[PDB]
Each structure stands twice: as structure tokens, then as C-alpha cells.
Amino acid sequence: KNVLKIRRRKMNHHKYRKLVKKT
């Protein structure tokens, strides 16, 4: 199958980790 649902979760978790890093 495609990984489009994983890709959404992939970006969500990346942005979250980066937010925690900044703050």
C-alpha cells in the first residue's frame, strides 16, 4: 500500500519533536 498515512504521521512527529526542541 501507499505510505500517505505514515507520511502524515511522519510530518506530525517531526514538527512536534522540533517544537519541543525549540521550547
Residue ranges binding RNA (CB under 7 A)? 1, 3, 5-6, 8-10, 12-13, 16, 20-21
Residue 21 interacting entry, from RNA, Mg ion, none, C-beta within 5 to 8 Å by type: RNA
> Residue 7 touches which of Mg ion, RNA, none (CB < 5 to 8 A by kind)?
none
Q: Residue 7 CB, nearest distance to RNA (Å)?
A: 10
User: For residue 23, what is its C-alpha cell?
Assistant: 521550547
Range list of H helices, 1-23 = 4-22
